[PDB]
Each structure stands twice: as C-alpha cells, then as structure tokens.
Design a protein around this ligand. Structure first.
Ligand SMILES: CCOC(=O)[C@H]1CCCC[C@H](NC(=O)/C=C/c2cc(Cl)ccc2-n2cnnn2)c2cc(ccn2)-c2ccc(NC(=O)OC)cc2N1
Length: 238
C-alpha cells in the first residue's frame, strides 16, 4: 500500500495473507474471508500455482512476523478461478479458495458482507484498501498490515485514464487524481472495503494498475457486486 498507515489489530478481520510454500514460504497475495470455508481473492495470484497443496491461508494476522513454522493456518482444498479469466487487465480477475477446515469466527477473524443487488446503485464514500504490499515500486512486503482511504472513480473517468484498455463495468476504479495513495505489489487479491449504513462491504478485489499511486492512474479492482451470482454459484452448489 502506497501512502498508507499501520492498521490496528482487529481493524480488518476479513483480511487474510495467502502464502505459497514453493520454493520457500512467502506471502503471495491478500484475500478476504467471505464464508466459513471461503476466501475471495484475485485469479492472477495463481499464475503458475500448479496445486492448492502449496498454499497456506493465515487469518487474524496483523504482522507478518506472527507467522512462523508453529503458526496455525488453513489448508486449501480447491482453487476456483473464474473460467472467463485470461489476465487481470481483461477482467474476471476473481478466484475462490475452498478451505480444508472451517474458520471459527471471532473478533480477530470474521467475514465481510458481499454487496447486495440494491448496492449496485449506492455511492460509497468511505472506501479503504489494505494489504502487506510494497510502499513503492521497488520495495519489500511490509510487516504490518497497511491501510489507505481512497475515493471511488466513475467508469467514464477511469476509462479516460486508461487509453488503450477496455475498462468494463465488471471493474471498479479508485484513487486520487493527483495520486499518492494506492495498492501496490503484494496487495493484489486483498479487499477494497467500503462502509455503508455502518456495515462493511467487499466492493472490490485489488487487481491491477499502471505503476503505483501515480497521478491520473487509479487502481483497478474487480467489481464484486457484478460477481455475486458467480460467488453464490460456486459457494452454494448443491
Ligand atoms: C511469492 C510469489 O508471488 C508473486 O509472484 C506475486 C503474485 C501476484 C502478482 C501481481 C501482484 N500485483 C499486485 O499486488 C498489485 C498490483 C496493483 C494493483 C493496483 Cl489496484 C494498482 C496498481 C498495482 N501495481 C502496479 N504496479 N505495481 N502494482 C504483484 C505482486 C508481487 C510482485 C508483482 N506484482 C509480489 C511481490 C512480493 C511477494 N512476496 C514476497 O516478497 O514475500 C517475501 C509476492 C508477490 N506476489
């Protein structure tokens, strides 16, 4: 996260850190708890991930230093990538992880609500991006989960900012015209969380952008409200 500040423990209890153990264990991507065995994240996280056996999901984490060999994690039973996904810049950048065991909810780990059909028309004014990603293009994964408050940008404005790309309504953009606050490397898959009527909603999934926090280059997020039917199809299968 560029231009952000340290989160307080328990502030973003749906935020997870997904680690890969291959070739060595390291943070791979962010993700969000949406159900007791479900993490929503970005499909591009799994480029070259050949098996869910190499993944570890850590919840209730503020600092990456809390993770050692003896730290409990959730194994991944299945990786479900949207089958229209080709690459982040073309959309459908969404994936579900089905956990091997159930998350016991509490003050450190609980799900974030998905947006409702009616929420497609609401204007969110309190949106935050969180993650352990870089604070600049050439940096390292941060120990403490960072947060940044960022305004949503209309589809028309985002399209003007990305000449040569097709910004669809299945994407949602966020960022200041002058830049300065944005997601960066290591933040992808994490949430863009917006508070509406005192309830946090998972509005976006951190996906891509041209550089980090540049002027007139807002971050591009998967627009979660457009995938609620897909998420229910995969998580509520008979
Ligand atoms: C362990 C292997 O992990 C990996 O290969 C990647 C897998 C994911 C690939 C895409 C990902 N993109 C974003 O996170 C965000 C992009 C972005 C989003 C918005 Cl909305 C706006 C502007 C954006 N950017 C424009 N330029 N930068 N960001 C990314 C992540 C890393 C590097 C490059 N790109 C990366 C770096 C270090 C570690 N771990 C580590 O060092 O552990 C000790 C892990 C990873 N993950």
């Amino acid at each position: 996260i560029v231009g952000g500040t340290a989160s307080v423990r328990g502030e973003w209890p749906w935020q997870v850190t997904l680690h890969t153990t291959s070739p060595t264990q390291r943070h791979l991507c962010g993700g969000s708890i949406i159900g007791n065995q479900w993490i929503l994240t970005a499909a591009h996280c799994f480029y070259g991930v050949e098996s869910p056996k190499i993944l570890r999901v850590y919840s209730g984490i503020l600092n990456q230093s809390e993770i050692k060999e003896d730290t409990s994690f959730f194994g991944v039973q299945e990786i479900i990538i949207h089958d229209q996904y080709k690459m982040a810049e073309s959309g459908y950048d969404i994936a579900l992880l089905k956990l091997e065991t159930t998350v016991g909810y509490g003050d450190s780990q609980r799900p974030i609500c998905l947006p409702s059909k009616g929420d497609r028309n609401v204007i969110y004014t309190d949106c935050w991006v969180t993650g352990w990603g870089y604070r600049k293009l050439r940096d390292k994964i941060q120990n403490t989960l960072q947060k940044a408050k960022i305004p949503l940008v209309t589809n028309e404005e985002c399209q003007k900012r990305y000449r040569g790309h097709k910004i669809t309504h299945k994407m949602i953009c966020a960022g200041y015209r002058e830049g300065g606050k944005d997601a960066c490397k290591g933040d992808s898959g994490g949430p863009l969380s917006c508070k509406h009527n005192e309830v946090w909603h998972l509005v976006g999934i951190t996906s891509w952008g041209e550089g980090c926090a540049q002027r007139e280059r807002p971050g591009v997020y998967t627009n979660v409200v457009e995938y609620v039917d897909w998420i229910l199809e995969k998580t509520q299968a008979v």
